[PDB]
Design a protein around this ligand. Structure first.
Ligand code: A1D75
Lengths: 767, 451, 459, 92
């Protein structure tokens, strides 16, 4: 099978492959670090006397250790050498540097070493009662045995032989949980395990993509992918067969220079994954991802137990501990990065088509001819010219519902943006207020519960107002518009018009929410606003779409971080201030929770509104503006989360020894930069006030000296300034910042940073 | 060699043609030109209007000299691409409200059936092999070399009739995705061909995107004595490249088997690879002027000079990059005193730290770029793609931006993005580079003075 | 200790901020656009596109003075406030010395405008006052300081009427008997408006300069005035703020005179005391201008109903301009004095000591920088002075050099005017400003900062 | 060295854009355009459509190397020389 003649791109597979490769590279580097650290060197242990002089006759070079076969620590016997080096008729009394720690249970084992003559002395044990953890006992058999025969005990039957074997090898060849549980000097280099695990995960994903993309017609022909609801029937039997078919080939390498022959396999596997997995619809891609995840989980829980049945010393120990902590943090943080990338970048082609579609829609509605208006009566010919033919003409084949037009009365019509009060709520008959039989022919049409707050220029509205259906066909629409025109509809009160219909585009699969709104500050004056929000109508009821999976993963990450940080926050109690720290963690959890909540809200709103529209098509409006706004908010929150994670990635680069100076320099120079920032803010405020006071006094005859030194925000010249409705703050801030930049005044940071960097570099290499 | 290729002003040769075709209004009343097409009717006005006026000039069906000097070679050809009706997926909830659907352009979705008054070659699909074409890579997508083509006439009175007949029997439906126009001119006063291509793309979402391409070529090289001098220089350059190749091969054979940790050997191999690629392209484009011979046998046909122009452009790009790197290699010899030596040592010893800081600088740069792409990407027109976001940020560094447009798109998170970007780029990132450079320069100068 | 001093100064600062905010939003600047656009932007007639902004001859000016002027002066919807006046200044025939090499064809010569060459003879029909000389004293006039010269207050004037029916007749009479001969060198038009729609005043001045080389140079200036009275509560708040500011500055000058009385031996060796004295002198001149305009704004309401007498209201506009320009620099200096006071922590102490210990060196290098700057400006004036229109005068050359430093270069006419020595000047100027000279300030600051940090660390 | 790099960039710009921009039509015009680039007085709507690749690469690399490397090197030389001269004259 050779599918996908088209040249579309599925970003899921390439993004996951890139994340996996980067994780492999950084883990390989850190494991090479750990490799050379461990090679440079290669509480159960007590610090009491171990003198056993109750026997003799065993004078020989003997040096054996003990095995603390307990919980959280599985280490074998070690070796040591003293002054006498175990001379004749001498028993060594010393301690070993064994980092294994045992508990208060019957878990203790000691080995023996008899090189040459058999042992004759009886060394009972090391006399210790309570030194660090009291994980030893001053009593043993102390009986002679054969060569290299260690006496058993607590604090040959098969029921005791293989039971103890499941404690020293259970954390030895448990491939997933073996990078941080490797015994000293095991001939696997601790990186071939990483190589094999990355090989196998690559194979798992690759085989799943091949099955979902190429071999999908033999058994389930004519659309094999038809199931998305998780009911333990889908994606549960999918990764199992892949694991079964690619696990023996793993056993071929696990039993060498297999890394050189395995990098080629990784390359070809990722190439195939990018080749066949590119033509995946959203359901197929999420099904593939869940199948791979299920395969990994089953291998970690079902296949791993299957084959297992068959003084600076404290400084080095804490170094090892923090290295393992860094590895765990790296894995969890990179999984979070993958999740947030899949949450953010799922609609890239959608994004480009959205820009192009909104631009086309804007130019087809005469945006320039609508915003640049100054006559409030040319709007009727405008809508009868460029709106009705747009809606009902053959140019717009997809419509998705009729338009609507709702106006607010406000009930205190102004006398010729200010001087506003409350809003009308009552009903009015044909013409205006005239209740004869029942309710007004122009009813209030109470605002909907969800979807409102357009947040205009000098007002904030809602979804309520006296609506007009504008008919369905062109002929009745003209009659309705002339009726409203010459029947006193907008004549008297005229708060707002709120024209909105919809837009669909099946070629790109996007909807667009188009809104036309006029605000009337005073009678005989009008200003117009245009907004076009394109979005994809993805529903909650559609099944197991990628947004849902990414959102639930993000919520799990949020609760994980919340509990992990609150655990330390509650231990400290109060007075946990003066650092970014916990506050930064609160910011992170707030962002990663809002991202999921807004996405779920968007999905639910989309589903509810689509069902409401399907109820009656040519009957209502259904108002997809709420869905568009929720989509935009979710996109912004995801972008902010990805920004924060990328900044954290940049910060975490300090672990290179020669590159650790930049972060320290910035952190130590922060107070001086803060002082200079305060001075610059004062100077910029003074400059902005001077500039505004000089520029807002006359036309073209301002002055001669100042305008040769007067700096404004880029893109706006010296001609059009001073907007007579509101003195906006953001352009003033831009003017201040750019005048600060252009007059120098931002290179004093260089003055401070040079001194700080030169001081830091002199304390890093010289000592 | 390179500046002989960049000979006396051909810029005016290109400018006359581009001003004649792109900037001429489509008709006397309307102000629309080819650079500002907005719909299909604008394209049909342009084809029957400024195009025919700019193509055919007056003095039995004689030839047309475009500026009384540029000779129109043969006939021009117009070609389009289409997609199939019902080539997408439409929801089942609207299958009675939406009837017809055309996907975006793809080789798997293109129409291949006769349509309309199926009489000539304008209403019948012709393969890429049968058209001798190739892929173009327009703005939206990479189009094919096939489609529905028509060969125009040598006079205005017949091309006008052909285009009118194409317009009556509707030739541009909603399925149209592109339209090409090609022709070539000679201008015997100098020895230089010009190959023109005019492309109009119709995106699936509506609208028109025009583009153009004017390329001068020289295909009859050996005419004057300066051409013979250039040929001799070409031979000399090939000899130099052979000598450099053999020298670098013998110096990488045994002595210094690694050979790559010098940055001058790397520059040498980069120059050699670019030079041999340029030589190969030149050999395999000049040795194939068989299209020119075919045209010269019968000059009432369409001259197929598209691949020649494409490979000329590729050769120009390679030659420009090669000249850049050869000029950069001049730093290997400017060590005649101590002032240049200490500056070169300073740059060499600061590169290793500036790379480490530039990693962080570019990570933050890309974080800002992706945030801008995700937030302002659908509205601003300057952030529509990731590369455009990077270009816009580099322009903001120069101060070449319009803050009003990025503020209107999002009144909050627009000013925050702009202000924070400017502040942190000019106050923090631009000064750590200075800190590192000044520290390393002072260190090396003091070390040399002390020793 | 300094808590009250800081407190008093902070109180003083908020008063200035409130006054500026009250002054920043007078809703006048919109009005001055929409009042200047009536005269300087409306075509003279329906046929031609020419307006006062783009005058180019004498005939179009004659068209303008009967037309786009009367059309916009009698019909936003401002109204008249008296009688306007038209005046001209002119030179006399035979004011030159024609070279004897060519005199058989050049019979008449008129020099450029000057007091020595000004014409005083009665020209044309001596019917009215526009055909006879009246001195500067008899017109209560003053200098104007135009574009190509400075003009006195004398000349040949004529006061127009209040009804357009007679103003058109008299201007047509002045056009018939040729009034703008070859010797005419300038022409002024002045009047006043009310615009009863919104309570706000304005005085206008329109100038046309006739060079000796032919053509016209049109110039204009619009300056509104305010008749603010007790209308709203915000006005009362602003008036109370103004009164308390007057009392506060009175107290401040009391403390200043005390400071100069007890510490008269040394008061100009510090940079801040000079700031205090310039602030107080700017404040006193600003309040003097304010009280002068407040006293003199009541005189002008006599012309609102009907008076056939030209109101001389140019000094009010001049002093309003001076008042605004003084207020701007005053508030800037007050904010800098605020910028002085931040010396609380050790970090700000280090920053302030660094900025204070490198003042003489920065001033010393300012001299070299400005020597080079003015050498380049003089070169630009001597090369592009006649062609570019951005370098036509020395101060305009300096302004263009400051704009170029801020990246507002044109380089189109710079290269067109002189294809060589123009590009050379531009490239050398950019290279030396952006890479060499402007970095000496930063070098001085950096070395001073390093010295200060080392001194404190060893202390 | 600054001018060696400057002239290399000018030569590349002349060879790439020299036929279609109007700001790179001659070598001297290429040099003038570059000094004008530093001031942010460019279009980039005609550089980018003249050559979609190798045009943006040109602009990005030129901006990065002008603003982040060579300007800081000039300032570093000036700073170090001023400090050394002041220290030596003061101590002598
Ligand atoms: C999220 C939403 C997105 C929206 C947009 C949001 C935009 C946000 C853009 C971010 C750019 C990141 C830079 C690179 C980070 C790095 O590369 O590095 C970070 C570095 C981390 O430091 P680090 O991890 O390496 O190492 C430490 C180092 O060992 C010792 O500092 C330690 O302590 P010490 O021994 O000193 O006691 C300890 O701190 C360690 O953590 O720190 C630091 O704070 C960095 C200090 C920055 C300097 C700010 C100056 C504000 C001016 C006032 C501002 C007012 C300005 C506004 C005016 C408009």
């Amino acid at each position: 099978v050779f599918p996908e003649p088209t040249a579309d791109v599925n970003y899921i597979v390439m993004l996951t492959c890139a994340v996996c490769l980067v994780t492999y590279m950084v883990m390989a580097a850190i494991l090479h670090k750990l490799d050379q650290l461990d090679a440079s060197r290669g509480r159960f242990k007590y610090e009491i006397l171990v003198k056993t002089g109750w026997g003799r006759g065993s004078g020989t070079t003997a040096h054996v250790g003990i095995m603390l076969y307990g919980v959280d620590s599985r280490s074998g016997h070690r070796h040591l050498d003293g002054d006498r080096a175990f001379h004749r008729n001498s028993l060594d009394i010393f301690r070993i540097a064994t980092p294994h720690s045992l508990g208060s249970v019957w878990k203790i084992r000691v080995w023996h070493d008899n090189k040459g003559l058999s042992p004759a002395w009886f060394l009972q044990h090391v006399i210790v009662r309570d030194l660090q953890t009291a994980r030893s006992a001053f009593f043993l058999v102390n009986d002679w045995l054969s060569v290299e025969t260690e006496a058993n005990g607590g604090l040959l039957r098969f029921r005791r032989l293989l039971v103890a074997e499941l404690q020293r090898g259970f954390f030895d060849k448990h491939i997933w949980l073996s990078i941080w549980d490797r015994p000293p000097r095991s001939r696997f280099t601790r990186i071939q395990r990483a190589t094999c695990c990355v090989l196998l995960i690559c194979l798992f994903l690759g085989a799943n993509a091949v099955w979902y993309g190429a071999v999908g017609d033999s058994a389930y022909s004519t659309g094999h992918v038809s199931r998305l609801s998780p009911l333990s029937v889908d994606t549960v039997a999918v990764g199992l067969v892949s694991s079964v078919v690619v696990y023996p080939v793993y056993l071929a390498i696990l039993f060498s220079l297999a890394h050189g022959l395995s990098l080629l396999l990784v390359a070809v596997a990722v190439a195939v994954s990018g080749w066949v997995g590119a033509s995946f619809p959203p359901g197929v891609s999420v099904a593939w991802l869940l199948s791979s995840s299920a395969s990994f989980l089953a291998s970690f829980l079902g296949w791993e137990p299957l084959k297992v049945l068959l003084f600076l010393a404290k400084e080095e120990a804490r170094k090892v501990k923090r290295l393992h902590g860094m590895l765990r943090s790296l894995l969890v943080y990179m999984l979070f990065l993958l999740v947030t990338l899949l949450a953010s970048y799922g609609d890239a082609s959608c994004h480009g088509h959205a820009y192009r579609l909104q631009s086309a829609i804007k130019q087809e509605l005469h945006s320039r001819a609508f915003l640049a208006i100054t006559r409030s009566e040319e709007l009727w010919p405008w809508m009868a010219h460029v709106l009705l033919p747009y809606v009902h003409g053959n140019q717009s084949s997809p419509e998705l519902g009729p338009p609507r037009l709702r106006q607010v009365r406000l009930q205190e019509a102004l006398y010729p943006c200010s001087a506003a009060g409350g809003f009308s709520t009552s009903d009015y008959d044909v013409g205006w207020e005239s209740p004869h039989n029942g309710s007004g022919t122009w009813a209030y049409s109470a605002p909907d519960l969800l979807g409102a707050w357009s947040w205009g220029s000098c007002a904030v509205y809602d979804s309520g107002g006296y609506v007009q259906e504008l008919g369905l066909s062109l002929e009745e629409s003209r009659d309705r518009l002339r009726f409203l025109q010459l029947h006193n509809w907008l004549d008297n009160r005229s708060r707002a018009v709120f024209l909105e219909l919809t837009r669909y585009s099946p070629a790109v699969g996007l909807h667009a929410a188009v809104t036309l709104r006029l605000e009337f500050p005073a009678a005989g004056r009008a200003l117009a606003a245009l907004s076009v929000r394109p979005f994809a109508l993805r529903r909650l009821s559609a099944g197991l779409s990628l947004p849902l999976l990414t959102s639930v993963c993000l919520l799990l990450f949020a609760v994980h971080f919340a509990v992990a940080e609150a655990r330390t926050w509650h231990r400290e109690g109060r007075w946990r201030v003066l650092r970014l720290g916990a506050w930064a963690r609160w910011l992170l959890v707030a962002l990663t929770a809002a991202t999921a909540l807004v996405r779920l809200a968007q999905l639910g709103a989309a589903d509810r509104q689509w069902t409401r529209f399907v109820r009656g098509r040519p009957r209502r409006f259904t108002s997809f503006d709420q869905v568009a706004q929720l989509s935009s908010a979710a996109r912004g929150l995801a972008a902010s989360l990805l920004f924060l994670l990328l900044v954290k990635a940049a910060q975490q680069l300090r672990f290179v020894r020669q590159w650790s100076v930049f972060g320290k320099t910035l952190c130590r120079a922060l107070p001086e930069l803060l002082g200079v920032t305060l001075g610059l803010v004062v100077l910029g405020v003074a400059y902005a006030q001077l500039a505004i006071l000089l520029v807002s006094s006359c036309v073209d005859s301002l002055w001669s000296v100042a305008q040769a030194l007067l700096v404004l925000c880029p893109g706006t010249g010296l001609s059009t300034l001073c907007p007579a409705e509101s003195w906006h703050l953001s352009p003033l801030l831009c003017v201040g910042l750019w005048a600060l930049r252009l007059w120098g005044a931002l290179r004093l940071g260089a003055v401070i940073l040079r001194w700080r960097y030169h001081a830091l570099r002199g304390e890093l290499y010289r000592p | 060699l390179t500046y002989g290729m960049m000979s006396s002003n051909v810029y005016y040769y290109t400018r006359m043609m581009s001003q004649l075709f792109l900037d001429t209004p489509v008709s006397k009343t309307e102000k629309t030109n080819f650079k500002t097409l907005s719909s299909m009717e604008d394209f049909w006005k342009f084809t029957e209007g400024s195009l025919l006026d700019g193509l055919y000039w007056k003095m039995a069906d004689n030839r047309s000299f475009i500026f009384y000097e540029n000779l129109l070679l043969g006939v021009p050809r117009i070609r389009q691409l289409r997609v199939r009706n019902g080539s997408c997926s439409i929801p089942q909830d609207l299958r009675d409200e939406i009837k017809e659907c055309y996907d975006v352009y793809s080789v798997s979705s293109e129409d291949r059936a006769p349509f309309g008054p199926r009489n000539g070659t304008a209403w019948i699909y012709t393969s890429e092999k049968d058209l001798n074409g190739s892929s173009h890579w327009g703005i939206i997508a990479t189009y094919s070399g096939a489609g529905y083509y028509l060969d125009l006439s040598r006079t205005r009175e017949e091309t006008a009739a052909q285009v009118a007949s194409l317009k009556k029997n509707v030739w541009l439906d909603r399925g149209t995705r592109a339209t090409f126009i090609d022709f070539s001119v000679y201008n015997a006063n100098i020895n230089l061909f010009c190959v023109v291509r005019l492309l109009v793309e119709f995106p699936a979402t509506g609208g028109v995107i025009p583009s153009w391409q004017f390329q001068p070529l020289k295909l009859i090289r050996y005419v004057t004595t300066f051409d013979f001098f250039l040929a001799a220089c070409e031979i000399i350059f090939c000899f130099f490249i052979f000598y450099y190749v053999v020298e670098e091969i013998l110096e990488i054979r045994i002595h210094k088997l690694h050979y790559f940790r010098s940055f001058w050997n790397c520059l040498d191999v980069v120059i050699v690879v670019l030079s041999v690629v340029a030589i190969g392209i030149n050999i395999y484009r000049t040795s194939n002027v068989e299209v020119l011979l075919q045209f010269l046998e019968d000059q009432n046909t369409f001259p197929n000079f598209e691949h020649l122009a494409y490979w000329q452009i590729q050769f120009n790009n390679i030659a420009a990059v090669t000249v850049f790197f050869v000029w950069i290699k001049l730093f290997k010899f400017i060590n005649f005193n101590r002032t240049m030596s200490q500056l070169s040592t300073t740059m060499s010893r600061c590169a290793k730290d500036l790379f480490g800081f530039a990693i962080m600088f570019f990570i933050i740069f890309l974080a800002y770029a992706q945030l801008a792409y995700l937030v302002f990407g659908t509205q601003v027109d300057d952030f529509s793609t990731f590369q455009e976001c990077i270009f816009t940020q580099f322009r903001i560094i120069l101060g070449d931006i319009n803050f009003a447009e990025i503020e209107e798109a999002n009144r909050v998170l627009g000013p925050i993005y702009f202000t924070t970007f400017v502040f942190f780029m000019f106050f923090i990132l631009l000064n750590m580079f200075l800190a590192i450079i000044n520290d390393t320069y002072s260190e090396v100068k003091s070390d040399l003075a002390q020793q | 200790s300094v808590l009250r001093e800081l407190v008093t100064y902070l109180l003083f600062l908020i008063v200035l901020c409130i006054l500026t905010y009250g002054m920043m939003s007078s809703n006048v600047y919109y009005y001055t656009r929409m009042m200047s656009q009536l005269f300087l932007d409306t075509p003279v007639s329906k046929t031609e596109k020419t307006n006062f902004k783009t005058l180019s001859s004498m005939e179009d000016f004659w068209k303008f003075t009967e037309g786009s002027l009367l059309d916009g002066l009698y019909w936003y919807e401002n109204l008249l406030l008296g009688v306007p006046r038209i005046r001209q200044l002119r030179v006399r025939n035979g004011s030159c010395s024609i070279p004897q090499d060519l005199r058989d064809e050049i019979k008449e010569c008129y020099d450029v405008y000057s007091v020595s060459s000004e014409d005083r003879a009665p020209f044309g029909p001596r019917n009215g006052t526009a055909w006879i000389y009246t001195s500067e004293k008899d017109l209560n006039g003053s200098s104007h300081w135009g574009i190509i010269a400075t003009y006195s207050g004398a000349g040949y004037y004529l006061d127009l009427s209040r009804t357009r029916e007679e103003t058109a007749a008299q201007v047509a009479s002045l056009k018939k008997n040729v009034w703008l001969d070859r010797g005419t060198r300038a022409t002024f038009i002045d009047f006043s408006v009310y615009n009863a729609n919104i309570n706000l005043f304005c005085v206008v001045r329109l100038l046309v300069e006739f060079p000796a080389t032919g053509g016209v140079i049109p110039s204009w200036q619009f300056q509104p005035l305010k008749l603010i009275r007790y209308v709203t509560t915000f006005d009362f708040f602003l008036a109370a703020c103004e009164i308390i500011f007057c009392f506060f500055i009175f107290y401040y000058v009391v403390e200043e005179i005390l400071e100069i009385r007890i510490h008269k031996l040394h008061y100009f060796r510090s940079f801040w005391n000079c700031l205090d004295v310039v602030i107080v002198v700017l404040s006193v001149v600003a309040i003097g201008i304010n009280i002068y305009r407040t006293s003199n704004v009541e005189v002008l309401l006599q012309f609102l109903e009907d008076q056939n007498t030209f109101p001389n209201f140019e000094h009010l506009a001049y002093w309003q301009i001076q008042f605004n320009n003084i207020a701007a620099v005053t508030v800037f200096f007050v904010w800098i004095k605020l910028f002085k006071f931040i010396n609380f922590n050790r970090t700000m102490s280090q920053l302030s000591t660094t900025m204070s210990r490198c003042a003489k060196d920065l001033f010393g290098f300012a001299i070299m920088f400005f020597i080079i700057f003015l050498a380049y400006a003089q070169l630009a004036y001597l090369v592009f002075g006649t062609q570019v229109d951005d370098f036509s005068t020395f101060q305009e050359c300096i302004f263009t050099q400051f704009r170029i430093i801020l990246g507002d270069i044109n380089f189109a006419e710079i290269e067109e005017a002189n294809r060589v020595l123009g590009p050379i000047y531009f490239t050398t100027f950019v290279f030396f400003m952006f890479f060499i000279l402007l970095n000496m300030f930063l070098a001085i600051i950096n070395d001073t900062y390093s010295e200060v940090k080392s001194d404190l660390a060893q202390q």
